[PDB]
Amino acid sequence: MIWTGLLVGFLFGIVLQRGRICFNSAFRDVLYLFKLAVFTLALEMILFVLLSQVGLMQMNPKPLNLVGNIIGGFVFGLGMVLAGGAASGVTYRVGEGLTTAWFAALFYGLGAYATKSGAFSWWLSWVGQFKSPLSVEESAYYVKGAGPTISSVLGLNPWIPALVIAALFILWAFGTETKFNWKIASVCLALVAGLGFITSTLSGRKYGLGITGGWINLFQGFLTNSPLNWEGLEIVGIILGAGVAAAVAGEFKLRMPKNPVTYLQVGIGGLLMGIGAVTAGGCNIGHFLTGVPQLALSSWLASIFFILGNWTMAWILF
Numbered sequence: 371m372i373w374t375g376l377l378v379g380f381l382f383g384i385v386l387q388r389g390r391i392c393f394n395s396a397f398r399d400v401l402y403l404f405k406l407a408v409f410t411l412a413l414e415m416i417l418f419v420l421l422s423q424v425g426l427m428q429m430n431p432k433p434l435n436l437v438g439n440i441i442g443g444f445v446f447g448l449g450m451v452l453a454g455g456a457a458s459g460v461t462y463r464v465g466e467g468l469t470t471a472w473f474a475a476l477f478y479g480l481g482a483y484a485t486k487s488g489a490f491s492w493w494l495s496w497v498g499q500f501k502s503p504l505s506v507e508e509s510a511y512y513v514k515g516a517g518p519t520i521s522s523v524l525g526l527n528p529w530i531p532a533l534v535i536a537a538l539f540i541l542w543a544f545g546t547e548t549k550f551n552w553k554i555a556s557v558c559l560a561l562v563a564g565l566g567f568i569t570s571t572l573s574g575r576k577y578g579l580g581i582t583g584g585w586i587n588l589f590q591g592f593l594t595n596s597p598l599n600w601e602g603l604e605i606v607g608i609i610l611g612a613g614v615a616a617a618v619a620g621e622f623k624l625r626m627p628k629n630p631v632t633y634l635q636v637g638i639g640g641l642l643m644g645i646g647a648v649t650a651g652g653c654n655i656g657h658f659l660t661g662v663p664q665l666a667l668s669s670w671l672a673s674i675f676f677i678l679g680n681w682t683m684a685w686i687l688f
């Protein structure tokens with residue numbers, strides 16, 4: 371059943387490559403992607419509580435760690451701008467044929483590994499002491515010991531804030547040239563997110579779409595001989611689906627940057643991202659795309675600082 375990760379990641383890479391969902395150029399606002407993000411977030415907000423109510427799922431919000439979330443998200447934004455894309459853009463653009471993406475994803479994997487259990491694990495160990503003891507109790511909506519949410523703190527059934535924020539986000543989007551329209555893209559992305567949440571919970575990992583854990587699992591399987599899980603097969607599926615969707619659309623091509631220093635630029639970027647995500651407890655997918663619709667406070671804070679670090683590094687380079 372861990373091989374359902376391959377299929378979920380295949381569909382994920384297809385929708386990512388076709389919709390061109392770049393998170394690094396989404397956190398930089400248009401002087402399409404913003405509305406795509408808000409609509410996907412609202413649809414996931416409704417769908418997660420729906421699937422948890424019908425017993426197909428349980429939301430598992432990530433724990434709160436102010437130092438962790440804040441600083442890791444800032445560094446993750448820095449690295450995402452230095453790498454020319456966050457953890458999703460990089461990973462799926464590997465399959466499009468961009469060698470820059472190859473470094474970026476590879477140094478991202480190495481840095482995440484080193485931060486979790488390697489030369490940078492002292493920093494993660496020091497950060498872990500600021501973990502918030504706040505946790506929710508087991509419910510039809512939440513897994514026992516999960517992080518605090520907007521609904522849990524307000525003492526409300528998750529349906530209430532889910533529906534209110536989601537309806538406000540739909541008003542949001544609909545109130546203000548590709549034929550893969552942003553609404554159908556959001557619908558397909560939310561459906562893929564729900565499918566991933568379900569199949570991953572049945573796989574043993576009670577969570578939705580992620581990136582960091584998949585790369586860590588792949589590197590661990592290659593260098594440790596450990597068995598791969600749902601997330602590593604999901605990463606391989608992301609790459610495979612992005613590649614297939616780019617080749618069918620005639621968009622696949624092995625490419626190089628204009629100047630070789632970009633290779634040095636992205637290689638550092640990914641590294642920062644690897645240190646960022648693991649410190650922040652999540653990437654642009656694990657926190658923003660997956661944890662925000664669960665109304666996780668840690669995910670919202672981590673996304674805030676994703677965008678802040680993005681802005682800082684964007685001014686530094688530009």
Ligand SMILES: CCCCCCCC/C=C\CCCCCCCC(=O)OC[C@H](O)CO
Nearest residue numbers: 476477478480481484488489490637638641
């Ligand atoms: C410093 C960050 C470098 C990032 C490079 C990414 C690519 C990884 C490949 C080789 C790195 C080898 C260097 C590993 C540095 C830590 C090794 C270590 O444990 O250092 C102990 C110390 O030197 C007393 O024994």
Ligand SMILES: CCCCCCCC/C=C\CCCCCCCC(=O)OC[C@H](O)CO
Nearest residue numbers: 435436437438440441499500501502503504
């Ligand atoms: C140039 C940069 C210099 C450094 C500035 C970086 C900006 C972030 C700093 C602090 C945020 C976190 C503040 C720490 C708050 C207290 C520790 C904590 O989070 O504790 C929570 C837990 O419930 C009980 O420990």
Ligand SMILES: CCCCCCCC/C=C\CCCCCCCC(=O)OC[C@H](O)CO
Nearest residue numbers: 434436502503504520535666667668670671
């Ligand atoms: C209407 C749309 C939603 C609006 C609402 C957005 C919800 C807040 C989001 C992110 C902040 C999350 C962190 C908030 C700061 C927590 C700091 C704190 O007090 O933590 C203490 C300690 O860690 C434990 O007791």
Ligand SMILES: CCCCCCCC/C=C\CCCCCCCC(=O)OC[C@H](O)CO
Nearest residue numbers: 436437440444675678679681682683685686
């Ligand atoms: C180049 C321009 C750079 C401009 C500056 C970059 C952005 C700095 C903004 C915010 C830093 C963090 C402040 C956020 C508040 C942290 C304090 C906090 O969360 O405290 C919790 C408390 O400890 C619970 O017990």
